[PDB]
Amino acid sequence: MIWEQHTVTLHRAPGFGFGIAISGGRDNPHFQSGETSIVISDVLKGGPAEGQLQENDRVAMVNGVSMDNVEHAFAVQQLRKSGKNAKITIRRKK
Numbered sequence: 001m002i003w004e005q006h007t008v009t010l011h012r013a014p015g016f017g018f019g020i021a022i023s024g025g026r027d028n029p030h031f032q033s034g035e036t037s038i039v040i041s042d043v044l045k046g047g048p049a050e051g052q053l054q055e056n057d058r059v060a061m062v063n064g065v066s067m068d069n070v071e072h073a074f075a076v077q078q079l080r081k082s083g084k085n086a087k088i089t090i091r092r093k094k
Contacts (some may be wrong), residue, residue, distance in 0.1 A: 005060070008052050010086045018079060019047025021060065025072030029034050038067040038075045053090060061089035076084070081090045 010018040024030040024039040031037070040057035043049045059067045062078040063086060079086055 002094075004094055005089065007087060007089045008049070009049050010052075010088060012082070012084050012086065016044060016047055018054060018082070019044035019049040020079075022075055022079070023072070024059075025075060026069050026090050028072040035057050035066045036069050038070065038072070053088070054092070056093070058091040058093075059088060060091055061087075064083075 003092050012018055020040055022038050023040040023041040024035075024037050026036050029036050030039045030041070038059040040055055040076070041058065042055060043053055045055050058076065062065060062075065063082055065078055067078075
């Protein structure tokens with residue numbers, strides 16, 4: 001089995017944010033298995049991330065900051081604090 005890794009720079013659209021929601025984290029595992037990966041849980045239809053990220057995608061980094069085994073509030077924190085641009089590294093189970 002194989003994962004696929006690439007980076008995207010999401011361009012903020014005021015009123016819409018970066019157009020993604022995330023679940024997962026040290027304290028809020030998305031997975032039955034107990035895996036703590038921060039997970040792309042939704043992409044706003046036609047939003048800043050449409051056609052670039054997908055649901056159940058896994059987040060490794062946000063703005064050069066590793067999302068390895070972090071608390072959920074910490075990942076959100078990194079998105080919120082971005083500028084006009086949020087660089088996001090992902091891993092896809094495809």
